[PDB]
Amino acid sequence: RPEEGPGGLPPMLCPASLNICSVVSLSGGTKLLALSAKGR
Amino acid sequence: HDIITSLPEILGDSQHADVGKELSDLLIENTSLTVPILDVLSSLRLDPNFLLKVRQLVMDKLSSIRLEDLPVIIKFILHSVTAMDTLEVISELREKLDLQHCVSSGQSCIILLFDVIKSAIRYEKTISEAWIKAIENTASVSEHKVFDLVMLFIIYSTNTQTKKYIDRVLRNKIRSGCIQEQLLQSTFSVHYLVLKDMCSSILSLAQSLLHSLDQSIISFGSLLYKYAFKFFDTYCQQEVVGALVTHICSGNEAEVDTALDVLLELVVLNPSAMMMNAVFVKGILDYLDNISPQQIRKLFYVLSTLAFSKQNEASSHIQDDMHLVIRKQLSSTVFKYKLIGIIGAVTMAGIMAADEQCTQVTSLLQLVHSCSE
Amino acid sequence: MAVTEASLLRQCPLLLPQNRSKTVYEGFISAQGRDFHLRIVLPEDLQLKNARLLCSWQLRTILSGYHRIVQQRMQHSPDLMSFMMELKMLLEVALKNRQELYALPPPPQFYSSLIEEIGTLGWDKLVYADTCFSTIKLKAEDASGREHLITLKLKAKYPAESPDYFVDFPVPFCASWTPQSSLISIYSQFLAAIESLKAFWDVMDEIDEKTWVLEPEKPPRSATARRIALGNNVSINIEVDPRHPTMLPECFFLGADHVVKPLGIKLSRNIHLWDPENSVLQNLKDVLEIDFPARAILEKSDFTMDCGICYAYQLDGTIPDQVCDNSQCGQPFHQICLYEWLRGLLTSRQSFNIIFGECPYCSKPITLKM
Amino acid sequence: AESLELPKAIQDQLPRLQQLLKTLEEAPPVELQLLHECSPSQMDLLCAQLQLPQLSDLGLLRLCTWLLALSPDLSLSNATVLTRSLFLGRILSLTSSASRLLTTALTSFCAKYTYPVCSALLDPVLQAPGTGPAQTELLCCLVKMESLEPDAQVLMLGQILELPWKEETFLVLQSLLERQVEMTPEKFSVLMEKLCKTTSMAYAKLMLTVMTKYQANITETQRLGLAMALEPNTTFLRKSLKAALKHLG
Amino acid sequence: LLKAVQPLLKVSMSMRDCLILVLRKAMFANQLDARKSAVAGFLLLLKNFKVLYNSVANETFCLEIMDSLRRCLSQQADVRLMLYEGFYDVLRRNSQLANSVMQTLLSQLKQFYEPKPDLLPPLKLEACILTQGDKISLQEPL
Ligand SMILES: [Zn+2]
Ligand SMILES: [Zn+2]
C-alpha cells in the first residue's frame, strides 16, 4: 500500500506452474524458476 | 417557502390582518419559517400594534432559532425600533442573547451578526446610547457574559462621541468588581476574530486605564496589553510595544512598575516576536533620569534577556550600547549613578551566563570591583 | 416481548437451546445479512460473570480487538438476552468499520446491466474501466471541439444508490440521480453542464492561445484564475466568473508602482468602454489600449527571473512577483524572501499591512503589501 | 426501596464526579471512564444521585460532548439509562420550541448512539399525553439528521410502527419516509396495514408520500386498502389522492 | 445616489441582482417614498443597461420589470408621473423595448380618450380625478 481490504489479483498469463520459487535479482527484473505441470 | 414569499402580490388591501394573525399563529408553531414570514410581514400592511406583539413574540423564541438565520432576525428587531421603546427592547435583547451556545461554522455567523449590529448603530444613533445604558444600568448582577465586553469595545471602535462615556462606565465597572479577568480571558480567547479588526480602540482605551490609580484598573489594562500582543497581528504588536515604551518613559511610579511587569510578560510569552521590535525598546535607555534602581534592575533584565537570544547576535548592537551606558554610569563620582552602573553591569553579567562570554563577564566585574573599591 | 422467553426468540431467532435445562444455547447471530456461528454455554445457573463462549474462527477474526469489551460486558451485563443484543450492536460496529474488508458486488443484476448500459451509451465514449469494475470514466466533446472527462465510481449496488461522480469543471456539478436514471441520464446532464459553461472554456482557451499565461502553467479545466504577463516584469492576474465570463473579471496589476499607475488610471477612465458582447482579450485590448506579447520567449526571454535572494523560481507555489520601482534594478523577488529580508533591517517601518524598505540590490524605496 | 448498592468505586468517587459536573456548567476526565463499571441497575441509581436531569442545557451539551469522546463505546443498556435521565424530563417540560442549544445537543448525541437514544426517547414522548408541536419538532429533526444512516432509519421505522397511531405519529412517520428509506416487503406490508386502518390532512400527506415514492412496492390489495382509508371527503387533498391512486392502477 | 453609483451597476452584475431584491421588496413597502424611489431605481436600471447568461433572459427580465411597472401604472399621480418622464429616456437609449412601452402608454391614454368624432369633450376629465370625501386629488396627469 491497513494492509488490504479486498483481494485484488491479476494473472501473469503464464500456465499452471506448480512449485514456484524466487531468486531476487534487484539489478533487471525479478526472475523465478518454475516447473510446469507438464514437466518442463 | 416559495408560495409564502409570493403572498403580497396576490392579496388585496383588505384581508391582511387575519393573514398576519394566521401567520403569527404559524410563527409560534414553527421556527424553521421565521425568516421568510418576517420578510413577508414587513412587506404586508399591518397595524403597528400587531407588529409590537410580533416583536415580543419573536424575541421570546430568540434562543430557539438555528444559528444561520439569527442575524436577519435582529436586522428586523433593530429596524423595528422607535426612539421611545429603545431601552426595553435593547435590555431584553442584551439579556436574551448568549454567544455561549452558538460555537468556521459558529464564528462566521457571529461575525455577520456583529456586522449587522455595527451597521445598525452606525446608521441610527440612539441605539448606541440606549445600549450602553442597558449595561451600565445592569451593574447589579456579577454574572455578565462574553457579549457585554465585545459590545462595549465595538461601540468604542465606532462612533466616537461616546468614548468618554464608555470610559467612565468601564471605570465604574472595574472598581465595582463586576469586570475582571475570566471575562476578558474568555472574551479574547473566543471572539478574537471579531476583535482583531478593532485594535486601535483597545489601545486608545488601555492608555486611558493605566493613567489612573486603583491597581485593579491598572492590572485590567495590563491584561488588555497582554492579550492584544498575544492574539492579534504584527502591527498591533508593534503598537503595543510602542505604547509600553511611552508608558515607562513618560511615566509615574505605579504605571511604570506595572508597565515593566508587562514588558517581562511580553518577553517571556513571545520573545521571538518581541525581538524584531526590540529596537524601540532599546531607545528607552536615552531616558533614565526618571527611573528608580529597582525599576532599573527589571529594565536591564528585560533588555539583556532579549539581547542574548543566540540568533540575533547579528544585532549585537544593543549589547554594545548597553556596555556604553554601563561604562558612562560607573564612571561617575555620584553614588546615584554608581549604583545604577553597578547593578546594570552585574545583572547583565548574570544573564549572559546561561568562552567569549567569560571574557566579557570577567572584564566587566573587574572594572566594577575597581570602581567600587 | 417483556419476559426473556419470547423476546429472546424475537431478538435472536437463530439461537436454539440444545439442552433441556436452558444452559446450552447454539446457533447463529445475524448482522448486516450474515449469519455467524456461536455457542454459549452457561453454568448450572443464569449468571454471566462466568460462562463459556466459543466461536467460529470467522467470528474471532471479526471480534479482534473488541476481546476486552465482550469479556468486560459478560461481567457487567445482567441477562443473556441483553448480552446478545449488546454483542450484536458491537459486531455491527466492528463490521461497519471493516467495510474496506467485507465489500462484494452481485454477479446477476450488476455486470450485465452495466454492459447493457455502456453499450447504450456507445463505445466511442468509454475511455477507462477498472479491473474491479468500480471506477469507470467517460468522455464527451464540446461543440468547440474539446475533450472533457467524467469519472464515475460504482458500488456493489449501482442502480439503487448514486454513483460517485467526479468532474473537472469549476462550477459545482449537480446530478439529479433517481433509481430510474442511469449513466445516459447523468451523461445528458453532463453535456448540458458542458454546453452551459461553453462560454467559459472559449474564454480561457482564447487567453491560453493568444497570451503568455504564466501561473496556471498547463492549467486544468477547473482553473478560473489566469496570471497574464504583459510588457516585461509586470503581470495582471484575472479571476473570471463562470456564469458571466464575458462580464468584467476581477483584475489587478503587479510590478513597478511607477509603471503600474498608468495601467490602473487608463483602465479606470476607459472601463465604461468595456463591452460584454466581445471577448475578454478583444475588450481588454481596447480598454487598456495596449497589446500583449505572444510567446516573446516564455522559457527564457532575457532576465535571470529567479528571486535574486533565493535565486530560485517556484518557492512553495509562489512566483517572483514583487519587483523594484526602478528602471536600473527591476529585480523580482518572492514575497517570503523580501519579507524576511525587510523585517530584519533597522531602516524598515511597518504600517498596517505594508512594509517600506530598501531594495537589496539598489537600496531604493520598495513597498511590500502582505 | 430496591436496596441497590452503587459499586464500591462509584460510592467512593461520587463526590469527585459531582465536583467536575458542577464545574461543567460554568478532553474527558478519567472519572467518566468509571461509567463502564456500572450495571444498568447501578447506572440507574448513579444517574439519580448525580442529578443529571438538573444540569443546565449548556452543561448537558458539554456532558454529551464528553460522552462522545469517551473511550470505547457505552453498552446499549447503560446508554439507554443515560439518555432517559438526560432528556426525557427536559423534553416533556418543553412548551415552546426546543432551544437551539437543546436541538443541537440532542441531534449531536443521536449521531453516535442512534439506536439507544431513539428507542429510549421516541416511545415515551409520543405516548405521553398532551404531546404537542414542541415535542414533534425535535423528533422531525432527529429523523432528518444526515448522520441517521439508512439502517438506523430502518430501525427508527420499526420502532415507530409499534406506537399507537395518532396525528403526531403521522407527522414523524412522514418526515422519516421523506428520506426515501428502503423497506423490505414485510416491513412495507406492516406499514401499509397500519396505514390502511383518517379525517386529518396529516394522514393524507403520509398516504400520498407512500403512494408516490414507494409505488414500485405497492400491491393491488395495498392499493385498495389505501382507497378505502381515503374514501371520506373530509380529508384534505382528496382529488390528488384520487389521482395518485388511479395512477397506481 | 443611484445615478452616482451607477458605473458600478454597469460593470458588476452581482451588485445588480443584489439590488433587485431590495427594489422589488421596497415596491410593496408601506411608506410612500418607498415606491417612488423604487420606481426611480427601476427606471435607472432600464435607462442605463440592456442586459440586467443568455440575451433571451435579458429581454424577459426587462419585460418582468416592465410588467411590475404595468401594475405601477395603476397607482397615484406621483408614480405615474415619474414613470412617464422616465419612459422618454428609456426609449432614447433602449429602442428594443419601444413597442412594449408605447402600447403601455396608449392603453392608459385610451382610458381617458374617446374614439368617436362629433363628441366635443373628447376626454373624460372627471374620470381623471378621484374624490374621497371632499379631499380631491389628480391621478393620471393627462
Ligand atoms: Zn524567493
Ligand atoms: Zn532595486
- Could you give the C-alpha distances from B90 to B86, B113, B118, B130, B133, in angstroms and in order? 6, 15, 15, 7, 10
Other CB atoms within 10 Å distance of the CB of residue B52: 14
Q: Which ligand lies nearest the alpha carbon of C323?
A: 2
C96, C98, C101, best to mutate vs chain A, most A CBs in 10 Å: C101
CA angle B345, B348, B349 (to 5 degrees): 85
Q: Are E88 and E95 in contact (CB under 8 A)?
A: no
Cβ within 8 Å of residue B37, ≥6 positions away: B4, B23, B26, B27
Nearest residue to C150 via CA among C163, C139, C135, C161: C139
* Per-state percent for chain D, helix, strand, coil, to nearest 5: 75, 0, 25
Report residue B342: phi and psi, to 5°.
Answer: -55, -55
Interface contact flag, A6 C100, Cβ < 8 Å: yes
The neighbouring-strand residues paired with E137 are: E130
d(CA D54, CA D44): 15
Nearest residue to D91 via CA among D58, D51, D148, D133: D133
Other CB atoms within 10 Å distance of the CB of residue B210: 25
Cβ within 8 Å of residue D229, ≥6 positions away: D195, D196, D197, D198, D203, D207
* Minimal CA separation from B247 to chain C, in Å: 21
The neighbouring-strand residues paired with C315 are: C318
Q: C337 a known binding residue?
A: yes
Contacts of A8 in chain C (CB under 8 A): 131-132
Q: Are C158 and C171 in contact (CB under 8 A)?
A: no
Long-range contacts of B281-285 (CB under 8 A, 24+ apart): B281/B241, B281/B245, B281/B306, B282/B317, B282/B318, B282/B321, B283/B245, B284/B245, B284/B248, B284/B249, B285/B321, B285/B322, B285/B325
Size of interface A-C (CB pairs under 8 A): 12
> Which residue has 524605496 as its cell numbers?
C365
Q: Are B349 and B316 in contact (CB under 8 A)?
A: no
Interface contact flag, C248 E53, Cβ < 8 Å: no
Other CB atoms within 10 Å distance of the CB of residue C258: 10
- Could you give the C-alpha distances from E8 to C91, C213, C281, C327, E18, in angstroms and in order? 63, 28, 21, 35, 12
Q: Which residues of C90-125 are buried (b: 16+ CB within 10 A; e: fewer)?
A: bbeebbeeeeeeeeebeeeebeeebeeebeeeeeeb
Nearest residue to D105 via CA among B192, B32, B63, B62: B63
d(CA A24, CA D158): 59
Q: Which residues of B173-202 are buried (b: 16+ CB within 10 A; e: fewer)?
A: bbeeebbbeebbeebbebbeebbeebbebb
Nearest residue to E13 via CA among C202, C204, C242: C242
Contacts of D137 in chain B (CB under 8 A): 30-31
- The structure was resolved to a resolution in Å of 4.3
Q: Are B240 and B223 in contact (CB under 8 A)?
A: no
In chain B, how many H helices and how many E strands? Answer: 23, 0
d(CA D156, CA D159): 5
Cβ within 8 Å of residue D88, ≥6 positions away: D120, D121, D124, D125
Interface contact flag, B276 C343, Cβ < 8 Å: yes
* Minimal CA separation from A30 to chain C, in Å: 24
Q: Are D151 and D183 in contact (CB under 8 A)?
A: no
Question: Following CA atoms C3, C5, C6, C11 in sequence, which dihedral angle do they give, to the nearest 10 degrees?
Answer: 90
Q: C310 a known binding residue?
A: yes
Q: How many residues does chain D have?
A: 249
| Residue-by-residue DSSP string for B161-218 | GGHHHHHHHHHHHHHHT-S-HHHHHHHHHHSHHHHGGGHHHHHHHHHHHHTS--HHHH
- Could you give the C-alpha distances from D102 to C261, D91, D114, in angstroms and in order? 57, 9, 17
Tell me, yes or no, whether chains D and A touch by having 3 or more C-beta pairs under 8 A: no
Cβ within 8 Å of residue D79, ≥6 positions away: D113, D116, D117
Interface contact flag, D40 C78, Cβ < 8 Å: yes
Interface contact flag, E11 C248, Cβ < 8 Å: yes
Q: Is E28 on the interface with B (CB under 8 A)?
A: yes
Question: The dihedral of CA E68, E69, E70, E74: what is its sign?
Answer: positive
E30, E31, E64, best to mutate vs chain B, most B CBs in 10 Å: E30
Cβ within 8 Å of residue B134, ≥6 positions away: B87, B90, B91, B94
| SS3 label, residue C319 | coil
Q: Residues of C near A (CB-CB distance < 8 A)?
A: 98-101, 103, 131-132
Which cell goes with D204? 393524507
Other CB atoms within 10 Å distance of the CB of residue D119: 17
d(CA B131, CA B134): 5
- Could you give the C-alpha distances from D52 to C318, D56, D73, D86, in angstroms and in order? 55, 9, 20, 6
